[PDB]
Amino acid sequence: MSHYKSNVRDQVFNLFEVFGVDKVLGADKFSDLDADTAREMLTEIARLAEGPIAESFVEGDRNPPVFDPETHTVTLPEGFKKSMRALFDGGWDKVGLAEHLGGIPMPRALQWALIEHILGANPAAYMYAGGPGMSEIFYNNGTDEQKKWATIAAERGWGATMVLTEPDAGSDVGAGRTKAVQQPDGTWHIEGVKRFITSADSDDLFENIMHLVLARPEGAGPGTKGLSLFFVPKFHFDHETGEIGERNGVFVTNVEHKMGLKVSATCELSLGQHGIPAVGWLVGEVHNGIAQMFDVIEQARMMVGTKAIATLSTGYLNALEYAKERVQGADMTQMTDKTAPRVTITHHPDVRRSLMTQKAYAEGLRAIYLYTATFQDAEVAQAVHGVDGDLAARVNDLLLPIVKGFGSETAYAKLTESLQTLGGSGFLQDYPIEQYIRDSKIDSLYAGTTAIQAQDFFFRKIIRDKGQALAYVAGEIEQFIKNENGRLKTERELLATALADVQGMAASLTGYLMAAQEDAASIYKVGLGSVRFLMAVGDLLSGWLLARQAAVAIEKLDAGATGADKSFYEGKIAAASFFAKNMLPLLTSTRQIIENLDNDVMELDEAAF
Amino acid sequence: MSHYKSNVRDQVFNLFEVFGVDKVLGADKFSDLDADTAREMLTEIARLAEGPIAESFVEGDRNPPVFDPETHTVTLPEGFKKSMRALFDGGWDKVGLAEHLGGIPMPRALQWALIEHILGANPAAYMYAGGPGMSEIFYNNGTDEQKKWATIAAERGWGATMVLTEPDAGSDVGAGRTKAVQQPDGTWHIEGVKRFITSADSDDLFENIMHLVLARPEGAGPGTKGLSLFFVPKFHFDHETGEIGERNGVFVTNVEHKMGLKVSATCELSLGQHGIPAVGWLVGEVHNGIAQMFDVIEQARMMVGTKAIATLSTGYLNALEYAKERVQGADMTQMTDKTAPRVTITHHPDVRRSLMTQKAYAEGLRAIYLYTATFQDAEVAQAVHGVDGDLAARVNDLLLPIVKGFGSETAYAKLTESLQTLGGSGFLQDYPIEQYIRDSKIDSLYAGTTAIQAQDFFFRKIIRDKGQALAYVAGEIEQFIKNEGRLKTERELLATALADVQGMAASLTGYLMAAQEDAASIYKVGLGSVRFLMAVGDLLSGWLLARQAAVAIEKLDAGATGADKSFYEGKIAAASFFAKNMLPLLTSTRQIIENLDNDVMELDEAAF
Numbered sequence A: 001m002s003h004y005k006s007n008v009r010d011q012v013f014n015l016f017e018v019f020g021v022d023k024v025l026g027a028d029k030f031s032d033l034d035a036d037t038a039r040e041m042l043t044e045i046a047r048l049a050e051g052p053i054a055e056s057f058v059e060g061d062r063n064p065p066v067f068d069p070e071t072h073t074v075t076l077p078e079g080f081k082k083s084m085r086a087l088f089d090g091g092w093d094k095v096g097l098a099e100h101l102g103g104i105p106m107p108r109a110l111q112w113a114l115i116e117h118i119l120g121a122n123p124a125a126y127m128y129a130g131g132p133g134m135s136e137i138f139y140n141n142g143t144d145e146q147k148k149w150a151t152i153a154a155e156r157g158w159g160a161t162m163v164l165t166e167p168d169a170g171s172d173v174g175a176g177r178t179k180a181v182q183q184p185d186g187t188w189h190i191e192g193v194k195r196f197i198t199s200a201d202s203d204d205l206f207e208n209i210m211h212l213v214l215a216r217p218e219g220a221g222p223g224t225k226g227l228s229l230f231f232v233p234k235f236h237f238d239h240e241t242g243e244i245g246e247r248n249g250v251f252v253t254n255v256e257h258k259m260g261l262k263v264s265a266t267c268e269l270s271l272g273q274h275g276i277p278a279v280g281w282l283v284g285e286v287h288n289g290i291a292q293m294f295d296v297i298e299q300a301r302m303m304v305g306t307k308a309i310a311t312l313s314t315g316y317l318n319a320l321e322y323a324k325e326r327v328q329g330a331d332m333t334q335m336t337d338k339t340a341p342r343v344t345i346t347h348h349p350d351v352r353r354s355l356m357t358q359k360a361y362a363e364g365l366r367a368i369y370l371y372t373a374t375f376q377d378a379e380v381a382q383a384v385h386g387v388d389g390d391l392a393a394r395v396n397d398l399l400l401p402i403v404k405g406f407g408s409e410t411a412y413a414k415l416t417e418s419l420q421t422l423g424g425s426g427f428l429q430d431y432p433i434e435q436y437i438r439d440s441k442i443d444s445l446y447a448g449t450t451a452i453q454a455q456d457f458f459f460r461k462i463i464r465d466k467g468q469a470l471a472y473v474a475g476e477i478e479q480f481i482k483n484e485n486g487r488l489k490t491e492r493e494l495l496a497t498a499l500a501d502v503q504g505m506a507a508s509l510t511g512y513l514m515a516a517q518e519d520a521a522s523i524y525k526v527g528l529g530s531v532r533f534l535m536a537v538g539d540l541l542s543g544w545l546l547a548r549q550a551a552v553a554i555e556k557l558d559a560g561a562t563g564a565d566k567s568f569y570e571g572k573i574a575a576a577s578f579f580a581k582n583m584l585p586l587l588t589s590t591r592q593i594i595e596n597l598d599n600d601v602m603e604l605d606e607a608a609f
Numbered sequence B: 001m002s003h004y005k006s007n008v009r010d011q012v013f014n015l016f017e018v019f020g021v022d023k024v025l026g027a028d029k030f031s032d033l034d035a036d037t038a039r040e041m042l043t044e045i046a047r048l049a050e051g052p053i054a055e056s057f058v059e060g061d062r063n064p065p066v067f068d069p070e071t072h073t074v075t076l077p078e079g080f081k082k083s084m085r086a087l088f089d090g091g092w093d094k095v096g097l098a099e100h101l102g103g104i105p106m107p108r109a110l111q112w113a114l115i116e117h118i119l120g121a122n123p124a125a126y127m128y129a130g131g132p133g134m135s136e137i138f139y140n141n142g143t144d145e146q147k148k149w150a151t152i153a154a155e156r157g158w159g160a161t162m163v164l165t166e167p168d169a170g171s172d173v174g175a176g177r178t179k180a181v182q183q184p185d186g187t188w189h190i191e192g193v194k195r196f197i198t199s200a201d202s203d204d205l206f207e208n209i210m211h212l213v214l215a216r217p218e219g220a221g222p223g224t225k226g227l228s229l230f231f232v233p234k235f236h237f238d239h240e241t242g243e244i245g246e247r248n249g250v251f252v253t254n255v256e257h258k259m260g261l262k263v264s265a266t267c268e269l270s271l272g273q274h275g276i277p278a279v280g281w282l283v284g285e286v287h288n289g290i291a292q293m294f295d296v297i298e299q300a301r302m303m304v305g306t307k308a309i310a311t312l313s314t315g316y317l318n319a320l321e322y323a324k325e326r327v328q329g330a331d332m333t334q335m336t337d338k339t340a341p342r343v344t345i346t347h348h349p350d351v352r353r354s355l356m357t358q359k360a361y362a363e364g365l366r367a368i369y370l371y372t373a374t375f376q377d378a379e380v381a382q383a384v385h386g387v388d389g390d391l392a393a394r395v396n397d398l399l400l401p402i403v404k405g406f407g408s409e410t411a412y413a414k415l416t417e418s419l420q421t422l423g424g425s426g427f428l429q430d431y432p433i434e435q436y437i438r439d440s441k442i443d444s445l446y447a448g449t450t451a452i453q454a455q456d457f458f459f460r461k462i463i464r465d466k467g468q469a470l471a472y473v474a475g476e477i478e479q480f481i482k483n484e485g486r487l488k489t490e491r492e493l494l495a496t497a498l499a500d501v502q503g504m505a506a507s508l509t510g511y512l513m514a515a516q517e518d519a520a521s522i523y524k525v526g527l528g529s530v531r532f533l534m535a536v537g538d539l540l541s542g543w544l545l546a547r548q549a550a551v552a553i554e555k556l557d558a559g560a561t562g563a564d565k566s567f568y569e570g571k572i573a574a575a576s577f578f579a580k581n582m583l584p585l586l587t588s589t590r591q592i593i594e595n596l597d598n599d600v601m602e603l604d605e606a607a608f
């Protein structure tokens, strides 16, 4: 079959046996979707992903898009367009879209489980297919008349983009200089040059593209708060029917050459520079740009983390399948005997260590994103966790930088282990792992770098939140530790240490912040430790959710599981125990390092580096 | 300028101010090469590397070699061939080569500092240039007659390969099935298919190629001990004059498509399968192949480690230059103020943390490989360390798996920080870091995977050695810790690290002994082997950086100014940073290794 190896079994385990998302299925907004239908849809998109979507994964990398600078368009390889059309023909660009836009209502946890398969098989395909999702965000934020346009865009399958970045404004979105000039009739003319814009042209995939552009109204103040958000279509259109009209003044003027994600056209986007106005409409007819655009950023950050996680999963399963069949060397118990039988490399300790490291992080990361998604519907958060909608919203916001920052860094790092398992053959393009690595390196960068994720996590999702979301999650970990049954005692002990280590880091970083009121340079220590802190919280959450999974697996085994199910559950116990014993203790040293941070490295002269 | 950013200053700092290799220069075997000449040599090859060698780094990746099945040859991009001709025209392919083969005698520590520049600028260029070195190894192992051919090869500048691997024989070289059939005239016909052979064809770079090939004589025993080594030239030649004659039956049959290191042609090599025999000559007219071939493997392991270290160094210096000029955001003390002046990103804590991490590992890794090289000459090891030849050889053997395994893994991991510093632009081919990462991934694989390095390090370099080389090195660390305030906290952290590593070694040794009674206990050694190798690497890094800081302090107190002063200040900051941020993790690693169990070994394969 193809490069892409699905894990629907693990999705169903999380969704149904661990988190109990089927509790909300068959009722209320999910009236017409029941559990078994949910399982059928997971199986269907996984087969679709393993077949027609994965089919063009290599082709898109080896035959990347070609730019015509005179027409300002891109030509995509035909195999990839065939995969996109299979995605459209199944309606999968409409998963989780509201019913009034032609969607199938469903909890976000199931939506992201479905999308994982597209992201593991050919992640740029989901990126090109984000149009309908962006249309819903435009609908929610729009005027009544804009809601009509959003409905047309969703129904007609328009593409979409999020246009923030400029050469001088990447992490610092608020330095953007793209300008908006108000017209008497209430439209605006957008003038400037954006860069790194994903999908800014997409060949003939779509009838139109909705660019959602951040720009600064003439005379507005500085920073992100002076930015407004504009609906800037590639083509003007009939506002009543959707019929495409004159080309609007927004043109791709370069396409980047990238390490990976090559089939995803990443564009310099010129507005108002070619003698034709880039007409924009103010989104919701209010100046509230950074807030509106963050509705999109939140989904892109979830998507990017889930992509990284999906990629590690298929990288692990490729490595595992290879290790099961590769014969090399004798068992270590016979390494002195040069006539001993040769064994498959799964017999070797370092290979088993490597594979379990991959497995535990891949499955811990899947649990994290599905756990995060459990707080993205108030009904689900109430049904499975018993929390109100306000706390649910704060917990989801807390977890998003973990999913994005921890997921992206972890997935890339452990794909090193997946590739190593293949030996020399891992370095070949014949196997998919080297492309997984290249495709996933970007996940620590776009949608906000890891350092940006770490600062958001600490400054906004803990300090500004007054630690409510964090205290909730820490309390749920504590309950698991307290409610002994004794077969997970050492794991609970190790978790208790890791929770205390992370509580220490949070208190230390908060202390450096509080001490900055009298010595401003103390705040630098927050920066110095923020990413290590973010990564420690992800390890703690991975450890906890793996341990919860192990507890459910213990129940299912005690009850009499057999066959493939038994092996599945046995692997869950092994992963949780392995993770508790080999990853969690490192947090103690990370606590001590963070408790002792000094500003020596901030005081060093730049010339000394 | 080129992508390649060199660091001759750190090299000379290591060679002359820290280790004192200038003690041996200008006398004896090094009679005619003084310290000024050595420094001019480093600067010249650094210029070459930044100039014509680096010129074709991108070209070799974007326009890679092509296999021609019509001729069973590989075609190389013209720009890379011009880089190769610049290397040859300067004689750099004969550095550290024996004087009698046309080389310039020098200590290995200077040889590897020189080679570092080629490996940073375009590492495949050094790989194609291994011919003369391999010729000297053939000379040292050869019969009287074979020494004449080796001299011809070195002098005509033939290329060379090391031919071991087969599809079923990679880490387990002893499983190789390629066979050798003795002929009435004493030559051998070699019959087999080898895989992943570096440089197995090289277009028109060379007049001939010497393949050094491991193969099993008919009737020989199993395993590596049953293997012999054969000189198998691409063309037959006159054994007296070097005149090239008829084609020998050794053909490239494919070129692999790789993640990186693309301009290095990696080929399936077919011996005796295209209708004419692959005639080989038994090296030394002795059956001793794996021991002879390890003369080559040792140099390849040193080379791979140094390559990875070199690539991290130019990766770091690229990220540093970018960060000094990239303006983004306000200083963190002004983060609330949307009016505040924007700053270059070297003002941001996470960027400074990132850059210092890259710096401390790059310079600690350089110090490690140069330190290792000081044990590769008996004269140097005596002069700078006061060790005799037997212990120097064992210490070198101990450190090789560290240079290779720890160097390769560490360089690739930390290049992630280098790319991160560039932001979104790091993901672009317009900057070199993305190729550095791709070209660097293989360094954990060829010349023996990291797990092979870790097993060699523990079983062969410690246990078989009765821990003598290791106790020697631990004793040097302890001397530094005990000897003579500005480095008190660093020495305290080093003392904890040394005890951590000692505990790791004792725990693993215990697991190995228990295997006399419970054979499965040996699995626990395998489970902890790589983490133990990496921890020793971190300990050596911290110790050598701290030594560097101690020297830096002396030079500052003696009045260093200007650029020198900034350089020395950075050494003190890197040593302090490394000790406080990397070394403490070893304590948690010791505790994990102390409680390893076999649960993961007993798990059913179907549970994964």
Ligand SMILES: CCCCCCCCCCCCCCCC(=O)SCCNC(=O)CCNC(=O)[C@H](O)C(C)(C)COP(=O)(O)OP(=O)(O)OC[C@H]1O[C@@H](n2cnc3c(N)ncnc32)[C@H](O)[C@@H]1OP(=O)(O)O
Binding pocket: A126, A127, A128, A130, A131, A133, A134, A161, A162, A164, A165, A170, A171, A172, A173, A174, A198, A199, A223, A224, A225, A290, A291, A294, A296, A297, A298, A299, A300, A301, A303, A304, A445, A446, A447, A448, A449, A452, A456, A460
């Ligand atoms: C399921 C449907 C899928 C949708 C379609 C997706 C597919 C698209 C295909 C391609 C996507 C590829 C991946 C994304 C592509 C990109 O990379 S787009 C560019 C990404 N850019 C960033 O992520 C910015 C990075 N920088 C920062 O985040 C930085 O921290 C910012 C810029 C926020 C700092 O500026 P400040 O001005 O200092 O911000 P401040 O803290 O003061 O807050 C101002 C203002 O912003 C809102 N805000 C800030 N942070 C958040 C968060 N985490 N969440 C929501 N809202 C946030 C607030 O309105 C805040 O105002 P307050 O008064 O509330 O403080």
Ligand SMILES: CCCCCCCCCCCCCCCC(=O)SCCNC(=O)CCNC(=O)[C@H](O)C(C)(C)COP(=O)(O)OP(=O)(O)OC[C@H]1O[C@@H](n2cnc3c(N)ncnc32)[C@H](O)[C@@H]1OP(=O)(O)O
Binding pocket: B127, B128, B130, B131, B133, B134, B160, B161, B162, B164, B165, B170, B171, B172, B173, B174, B198, B199, B223, B224, B225, B290, B291, B294, B296, B297, B298, B299, B300, B303, B304, B446, B447, B448, B449, B452, B456, B460
């Ligand atoms: C200045 C010159 C520049 C470089 C030269 C030109 C380069 C041009 C080409 C560029 C090369 C690019 C990178 C290298 C290319 C490659 O990858 S080539 C293939 C590499 N293959 C390996 O490295 C093998 C990996 N596997 C092992 O090492 C494994 O551990 C082995 C195969 C050793 C296990 O087999 P065993 O049979 O079980 O080994 P054993 O321990 O029992 O010992 C047998 C025998 O081997 C010798 N030996 C073993 N280990 C060493 C070491 N570290 N050093 C020296 N010798 C060793 C011994 O002779 C031993 O016998 P004993 O009686 O002493 O035990």
Ligand SMILES: Cc1cc2nc3c(=O)[nH]c(=O)nc-3n(C[C@H](O)[C@H](O)[C@H](O)COP(=O)(O)OP(=O)(O)OC[C@H]3O[C@@H](n4cnc5c(N)ncnc54)[C@H](O)[C@@H]3O)c2cc1C
Binding pocket: A326, A327, A328, A329, A330, A345, A348, A349, A350, A351, A420, A421, A422, A423, A424, A425, A427, B162, B163, B164, B165, B167, B169, B170, B171, B172, B195, B196, B197, B198, B199, B258, B261, B266, B442, B445, B446, B447, B448, B449, B450, B451, B452
């Ligand atoms: C670009 C490139 C260049 C090369 N150049 C050359 C060259 O010039 N000449 C040459 O002869 N060879 C060369 N090689 C071959 C190279 O040395 C091998 O690929 C390497 O030794 C690993 O062998 P393998 O690929 O068969 O992997 P395998 O040996 O099959 O290893 C697969 C996995 O199993 C693990 N493993 C294997 N055995 C054990 C064990 N006993 N204990 C624990 N884990 C184990 C490995 O560590 C790895 O994770 C090259 C390879 C490449 C990719």
Ligand SMILES: Cc1cc2nc3c(=O)[nH]c(=O)nc-3n(C[C@H](O)[C@H](O)[C@H](O)COP(=O)(O)OP(=O)(O)OC[C@H]3O[C@@H](n4cnc5c(N)ncnc54)[C@H](O)[C@@H]3O)c2cc1C
Binding pocket: A161, A162, A163, A164, A165, A167, A169, A170, A171, A172, A195, A196, A197, A198, A199, A258, A261, A266, A442, A445, A446, A447, A448, A449, A450, A451, A452, B326, B327, B328, B329, B330, B345, B348, B349, B350, B351, B420, B421, B422, B423, B424, B425, B427
């Ligand atoms: C493939 C790809 C696709 C993209 N698609 C889109 C898209 O569709 N739409 C869009 O709007 N943008 C897009 N981007 C832009 C991407 O979001 C930015 O590249 C990213 O935010 C980083 O900004 P930058 O590249 O300018 O790096 P910089 O902001 O210059 O960052 C450089 C380094 O400095 C660090 N840094 C910067 N500021 C701070 C700070 N205050 N504190 C600490 N560290 C800091 C960063 O962490 C990084 O290490 C894309 C980028 C890529 C690579």
